[model samples]
Target: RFLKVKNWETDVVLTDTLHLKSTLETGCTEHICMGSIMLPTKDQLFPLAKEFLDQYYSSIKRFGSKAHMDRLEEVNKEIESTSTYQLKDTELIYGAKHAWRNASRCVGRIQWSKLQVFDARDCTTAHGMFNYICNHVKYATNKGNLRSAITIFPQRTDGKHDFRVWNSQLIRYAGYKQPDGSTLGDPANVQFTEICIQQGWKAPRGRFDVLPLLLQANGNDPELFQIPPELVLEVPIRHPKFDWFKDLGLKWYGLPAVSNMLLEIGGLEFSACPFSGWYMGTEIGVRDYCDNSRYNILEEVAKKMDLDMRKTSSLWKDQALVEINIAVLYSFQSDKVTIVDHHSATESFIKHMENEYRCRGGCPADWVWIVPPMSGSITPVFHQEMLNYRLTPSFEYQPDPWNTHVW
Candidate 1:
């Protein structure tokens, strides 16, 4: 028997018997792909709730058992009466870990099972959410020995009492739009940085000022809270071979805590789940430092290295890029901060892919993201054609709370 593969972007359907079957849906159609879109709001949760319960019970090897059936019945009853149900602490833990495992764009899935989930469903105010987030940042940072962690806020119930973290990451540099149309810090955060100022935050106008947290709870107006500086661990960038590299006045936070993603489990959406893992070297070195839209440091670095900047054939950009990445890896290592080189990360992901295939018969991967930004051809993942799909118990992109906010 053959399976039909529908090309979402091209509107072409092709039949193939060689590809393994997947129980999970890709959330795509022949003419449209919903992979990048936010998951639609649901009016009913009972059916998907039952499906997640089944998956949960099966995961714990108690499928069809009395406890499984009893738990399912209890959840169904709760949903029927109240339109929603709660996940126990243990269930929440499992769901968060599974969400990381099912993150299609992440290259570090091998470490997904090691997440430490902090449940903050009891949080009742914006200040309470801020306290939990600070604790999450501190615990995840661990003084540079970064740990994989997630802090989940209250689930979105009826979409009216939603709790949200306004920052994309717990620690992000402020970007100021200068008079001459230049950005002082990370250009990616200009709009957010402006928002911080509009919310009564005094901007220092420094190159790397840490932004404050904007938290909302119970559908109330978002309250701004400053993250204590001592709690945020930063590592200064340096190069082992080039002493001039340290003069760049560059540094980065140790924790990569993404605060804007929605965590979905058992038909429930946690709109404010902030998760952190250690940095991947290229994330800072390549994308953050080298991207023209961001820091735009490549030309400066190339000049410092005395490369021939006038000619593309000189490959000055590549040389400078490698040196910057080397400096990032060297600095983090010297500072005892946890960071993975792209080479090692990719190799580990390949092993993770194999493990997933052996255990689940398939792995959902987006090749463009899974491959590293630089030296793509050198990495093994560059040659691998991966199938992209969506799975439940996953982290998803949600609409910014401010966009849909009511007074």
Candidate 2:
């Protein structure tokens, strides 16, 4: 006989002599946070370890390091025994550098080796995390001359002792939805904003408010930490030629530090690896402003440009998008922030490809991400054939803290 259970699995058998035998399995699969937090089962260790070691060896060889494979074997044994494993300084730093290079979704992987990886494994409190994050922000911002950086916290060793950063990005604008079905700030952050509110965070009453960081030391209740206004850098966005565009009151943060993505090195996972890279112009110029789920300002910008919005043949939206991109490039240049235009950024990817080919035999890329959202036809990456595959020592997305129902 067999029976189905909602949250658990079970099986049973009926004997020929009318005696019954049964086996039962009980666990909560439905509500469990399985993304990166759960340790890989014993059976999964060998394959993942093998892949990680292979990539590490390839990277080390490319760097002209002649090392023996003794450490690899030792790490594998430690993993097999279910004991805590550690990465040597060279191994840890090199793994992070290559993880950036192997991040297929990133267009700016050209500077992968320059990332500053802070070893914050000893930190055991939410307050300590806040201080580290503040330092990272200060250093990475670099007075508008942005530098790439990543800070890794402790990894998940057991079910209850996992680390998680509650914010999607280290710096992001808050969203507040009004009763009239309109959003006061970033519409993409409305759900996250609600979660912040439930955690006793006071919602800012404006369109361009910066959201505070909610940090979780463990699986326990998360605590809210407000960033100092002095530490956060905001740039007032305006077009160089368009005088009236300044009236839009548009602005954005100088840095785009993503806080919540998981960084996987070997079989170990760091759930709170906050990393930052300089932004491509179109990320803010086109998608952030034009996406329907975001600011949705295409129509308004087109109207300002006096283009016919009734027909696609007019290409009013396209015209407006280019102007917006131009404005972003101009503003960042004027403000001394390290931002890349799409054309230059695309060219850099080619250099990255050549570098990887000389080092790792071949470079893996995702054509969709490598190509800019606007002016795709003009970018060389658009015509290039690319491939995406799972590579160890890489960044992986995880479930949002507020998205799951965990009571």
Candidate 3:
């Protein structure tokens, strides 16, 4: 599973806050809060959530507009005087999180519905909360974006759409010199998305008109947010043979081929290298369109490869190839694997490809894939480092190993 973020803000704010609780409830608890939020009429979902709060306030106001404030004070007192919704689980039963549970729909596997908190205390903070929820929506609202976030956001292959989170700020930002930097948009698409460039590599701007912040913050300027999704490179995806999910410090949870890689990393706990470089390579092989084909083709391939590799004493997870080939077969298209989904944790099937032959291997004839600068160091580390010198790749990246090169 990828990183999970449920609490949008600190719970300390939940104390003695009923209007806040009520406002949150009106948006979420007013709905279902349990099932997927993606339901009929996204157009009116926000308004209805708002109405829930308005109606609640209107009832309190009817107590006499002359002293509605007094009435609200009275109601607030009555609420705080005796209620467990706030004391027990304010966020759980009636908060932004509650609404998220209510308004979500499955995007892939992540439910994608917008969450609305009633209070507009701070537009910036509110925006962050909004963006935070939005970022969560993007990744978790059906697992499509979440998978994309886990696969692409952090480990940018093209470095285009780097902006990933919206907590505290309306953007994705790690510290000044942190390993994982800020989140940006697909730069190449900037022209199309911003200022309506009307020419040259544009963006899927039309798809994201709902957010003015992303549009405005992206800046119509060329250098601001125009990096192509292709340039956002992170841990280079080799093949799906060995479990890159586990290798790159991620847990496969219950995904297929997760066990083998567990053995590779010496029993399932990943080594988290704060400042490490990684190179990835992936080539989709042929598909096996048999009726009811085994889903664990990669698992089978890896196991089979492991059996053969063992003869050569090729350690599990140590020097094994990932199965980009399986992704190829399952991938719809022919040999070409789409970049939009270069690193799906599960559909990424083989999120990480950590092996020797493919990592440092070269072949101008085919796609001689190469990891970029500062990546070889993160490839492998074991007693075999000395004995397996020739087996390891020298980090002179050739780019596409299969794409026959010239000079």
Candidate 4:
């Protein structure tokens, strides 16, 4: 690596700053928790250990248990010796749920206490990661009932990022770039799909083909594993009243299993911790189908509805957008798939905030994500004031596995 370059002729010199911005200060994305634990002095361990102890003891208190002070002592001793450490199974399980409860941007935070945590830390190879991740898909899918769960792999240790789940989600559609400069299926996954195809993974012939799970272990190159189609539950979208909607061939997976987010427990990072929660209607309806970056189905849907496309005063696009969301909500309900509407989701957030106020004093929240994209003014979160602050033992985003220099 070239650093502080030199020129022999004029004695001119330049130095690259390498890394700028502090993880201690910046926000990664609108929907994740933020903050850092890095410090230069020996006193850093105290706050880190204190955070873990607080969460650990509070978790025990929530469960109405009298044990765990000894457990707290053990964790603190390990932190003093190693500068960082892993949690025990009981502590890890509690920390996982606490992480969800403390997650600021999640609208579904009401179900934070109900998450099932699976410990798969023994698996360190790509094949091992693939097997465990496939099991996560199989279990979370749950034959379309869609249980909430998270599988935590080992944290990065001793300068080694030992495990990583590369696909944005455990289940995602493959996007194929056509000759006409159009993309079929989820365009958000175009680059990932191309990477898979080049690595000897086969591309699906249809528009809504499920992409294989990509896993990388111990900082090595990635590996692909095709999930069994029987395990992946999908709902064929159809409108409640519009007769022509079924022919559109629109469908979405029953579960929203986010895989790339880093789970920070007591200052230790679990980059490969993939978790699942059911979808909210607009996530698929408005953004995935309506956003220009993704599917861009507004014009097609507007024509299907026979809306006058001549003028903005007609509100044609807005009408089409609402109908699309209605169809998504209807389809998920029709399939017995678990999905939350924005109204219910936001209402749940209010209840969650009240509970946190009683229990944790203050809740860190990102207002933008807390409010759904479709209807802002009507929701409770829209009227309420919110704050965005970093909390320890939370989930955050890390760099892409394919990207170099940072992990």
Model with the higher TM-score, candidate 3 or 4: 4
TM-score of 2: 0.85
Best by lDDT: 1
lDDT per residue, candidate 3, 1-407, as tens digits?
A: 11111112221111111222222221134445422222212343333323333333453454346454553444345434432111112211122222222221111112211322222112222233334334333332232121222111111112232222211112211111113452123222232233333324233333122212222111112122322222222222233434442233210110100000000010011110011011122211211111112111344444645454445455432222334333332332232322222233112211111121133221110001121111223322110111001100011111221122121
Q: Which stretches of candidate 4 lie over 4 Å from their true place?
A: 1-46, 61-73, 76-83, 405-407
Clash count for each candidate, listed in order shown: 0, 0, 67, 1
Q: Candidate 3: what lDDT?
A: 0.23
For 287-397, candidate 4 gives per-residue lDDT tens digits of: 999999899999999998889999998999999999999999999999998899999999888777667655655566667778899888888778766555566677888
Candidate 3, backbone clash total: 67
Model 3, position 134: C-alpha lDDT score? 42
- Sort order, lDDT high to low: 1, 4, 2, 3
Candidate 2 lDDT at 255 equals: 89
Q: Which of the predicted structures, 1 or 3, would earn the higher lDDT when compared with the native?
A: 1
Model 3 regions lying over 4 Å from their true place: 1-94, 107-214, 217-235, 241-407
